Amino acid sequence: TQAEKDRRLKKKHELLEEARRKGLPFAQWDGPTVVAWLELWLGMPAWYVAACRANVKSGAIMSALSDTEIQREIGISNPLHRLKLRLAIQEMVSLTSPSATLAYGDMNHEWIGNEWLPSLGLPQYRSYFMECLVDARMLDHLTKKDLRVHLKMVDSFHRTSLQYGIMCLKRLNYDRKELERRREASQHEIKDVLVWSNDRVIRWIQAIGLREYANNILESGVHGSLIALDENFDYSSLALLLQIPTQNTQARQILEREYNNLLAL
Amino acid sequence: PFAKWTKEQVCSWLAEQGLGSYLSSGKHWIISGQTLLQASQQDLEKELGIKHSLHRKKLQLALQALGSEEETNYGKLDFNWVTRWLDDIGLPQYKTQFDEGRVDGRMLHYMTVDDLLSLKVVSVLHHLSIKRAIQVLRINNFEPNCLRRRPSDENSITPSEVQQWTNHRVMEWLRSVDLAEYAPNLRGSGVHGGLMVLEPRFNVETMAQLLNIPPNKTLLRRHLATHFNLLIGAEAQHQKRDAMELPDYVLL
């Protein structure tokens, strides 16, 4: 019963290792191998996989896919799903050539949705990103219309937040192991701000003495990289976000000095 | 000569030719093998009471054959052989008609368009399929097992081989090239190696039509073209490209 659900999954892994260790370039992979690739490494959902399986029978074909072929033959109506595929292929063609970061699904569309986006203090958009199959590679390519229309970010500041988020991954060379490692190296010390999750930034606000106020920066898009990289983002704009009335002078004065320390060290 | 054979030697040959139904009627009408030859075309059709047209032609052919006295190869293949062969060329929907008309190797050789129309074979494509299959028999001196040999799979590294591929083999071929979902559409379609390889009018588009691959599935047809061409060879590829320059017009 499930014995045959395990065997066939093994086989799919076997086809891939057979290929990446026979050295072959993408445009020479056979159908079955390419189909394994879509499932295991791209994290493609079964419905999309089945479409490609029935219309794309070789790497040769796979590699040459135009947007309209994907659109009319494969029958993928959402432009973001299409871009997903093109970009994956684009990456695999380089990666497999005679010419001397690599994505094996490390930063696929579920890490992006369930881990990264909340890490940026943007958990409210999670579902739309998921529903669009947005992975790390696509992030760099999303336009403003993409973010408004397809991903529902009507807030321009949240778009800025995402941007800096991406600017972080860029500088980290998209290396997921190194992100998580740096993030936890700085849970109780006060050093590598570039990385800090919206969570780290909350708990920090509590540590300088603002336990009441912190919780308000939950779905605000406040995070380490914005703090570390945006010159516009100073204490004044952080206070505005924390919703501190102008009357409360001492809290502001607290944040102003501790924030500058945070920036200095 | 058949003319010197006894009534019984003639009777059993006649019955061996699948014509034993006319026996208990024309047994008194036949003393000698010579009396079979003496009889003009109409004497036999009256006296033996042969009423099916194909059956007349069959005897006619068979008689004029023994008269030459030379031993034709197509003539060596009886009707059961031909009816097996319909499985091989991809047209088993006709075995009833062919077997009932006792189509042998001679009748294959002297096949006319109305003959095939009478056997309810009416498809232009099936006439092509048969015409090219007979070519393959000619190429093989009408050796009984020329198709009914299957060699090994790898054996195809020379396209000549493909010439002798049956309908089953072509389907086995599609499965090896990831077109398993389509391979059964070729059942009863008369598609075989002889036709793929030798008919310049038969190409990728014909193949893809027969397989039910819509014109809009470009990516699938592309795959198919790539494999079809590797199958048929360089020359056969060139032959078919060349024919495209001279359209097969219906009315000159």
The per-residue DSSP string of B44-112 comes to HHHHT---SHHHHHHHHHHHHHHHH-S--SGGG--HHHHHHHHHHHT-GGGHHHHHHHT--HHHHHT--
**Which residues, other chains included, contact A61 with Cβ-Cβ below 8 Å and sequence gap of 6+?**
B219, B222, B223
Nearest CA in chain B to A60: B223
How many angstroms separate the CA atoms of A212 and A251, rounded? 11
Q: Under CATH, what is the fold of the domain B152-252?
A: DNA polymerase; domain 1 (1.10.150)
A76 and A35 in a single domain? The answer is yes
Q: Search chain B and give the residue with CA nearest A73.
A: B217
Name the CA radius of gyration of chain B, rounded: 22
Query: How far is the alpha carbon of A17 from chain B, nearest alpha carbon, in Å?
Result: 21
Q: How close does chain A come to B179, measured CA to CA in Å? A: 9
Same domain, A245 and A263: yes
> How many CA atoms are closer than 13 Å to the CA of A31, on its beta-carbon side?
17
User: For residue A243, with 0-12 CB atoms within 10 Å meaning exposed, 13-18 middle and 19 or more buried, which class applies?
Assistant: exposed
Among A31, A60, A74, beta carbon nearest to B178: A31
- Method used to solve the structure: X-ray
Whether B220 and A57 lie within 8 Å, measured CB to CB: yes
Q: Are residues A33 and A82 in the same domain?
A: yes
CB contacts < 8 A (A, B): 31
Last residue of some domain: A102, A123, A151?
A: A102
Residues of A with CB under 8 A from a CB of B: 30-32, 54-58, 60-61, 65, 69, 72-74
Q: At a CB cut-off of 8 Å and minimum separation 6, what does B226 contact?
A: A58, A60
The conformation of residue B22, written as its DSSP 8-state character, comes to T
- Considering the domain architecture, whether residues A217 and A169 belong to the same structural domain is answered as no
Whose CA is closest to B137, among B54, B69, B198? Answer: B198
Check CB contact under 8 Å for B218 and A31: no
CB pair distance less than 8 Å for B223 and A61:
yes
Coil, helix or strand at residue A116: helix
Structure tokens at A225: 């990289």
Rounded Cα distance between B137 and A38, Å, is: 47
> Beta-carbon neighbour count of residue A246 at 10 Å?
8
When CB atoms are compared, the residue of B179, B220, B226 closest to A55 is: B220
Q: Which residue of B has its CA nearest to A65?
A: B219
Domain with A217, as residue range(s), is 186-265
Do residue A203 and residue A258 come from a single domain? Answer: yes
Same domain flag for A107 and A166 = yes
Question: In the structure encoding, which two tokens stand for residue B15, read together?
Answer: 């019955």
Distance CA B10, CA B66 (A): 13
Which residue from A57, A69, A74 is facing B223, i.e. has the nearest CB?
Answer: A57
Suggest the residue from B219, B220, B222, B230 to mutate for an interface test with chain A (most A CBs closer than 10 A).
Answer: B219
Fold of B1-49: DNA polymerase; domain 1 (1.10.150)
CATH number, residue A41: 1.10.150.50
All CATH 1.10.150.50 domain ranges of chain B, comma separated, are: 1-49, 50-151, 152-252
Q: What total of structural domains would you count in chain A?
A: 3
- Both A174 and A133 in one domain: the answer is yes
A128, A44: one domain:
no
Comparing CB atoms, the residue among A32, A58, A73 nearest residue B217 is: A73
Query: Do residues A9 and A25 both lie within one domain?
Result: yes
CB–CB contact A69 B218 (8 Å) = yes
Alpha helix stretches (DSSP H) within chain A:
3-20, 31-40, 46-55, 59-64, 67-69, 79-95, 109-111, 117-119, 126-131, 136-139, 144-145, 156-171, 176-185, 198-207, 211-214, 224-229, 235-241, 249-264
* 3.90.1150.10, 3.40.50.300, 3.40.50.1820, 1.10.150.50: CATH of B50-151: 1.10.150.50
Q: Report CB contact under 8 Å: A61, B222.
A: yes
- Distance (Å, whole) CA B210 – CA B14: 41
Same domain, A27 and A124: no
Place of tokens 């074909």: A61
Neighbours of A100 (CB within 10 A): 3
Nearest to A58 among B181, B216, B223 (CB): B223
Both tokens assigned to A214:
């912190």
Q: Is residue A117 helix, strand or coil?
A: helix
CA distance B218 to chain A (A): 8
A64 burial (CB, 10 Å; 0-12 / 13-18 / 19+) is middle
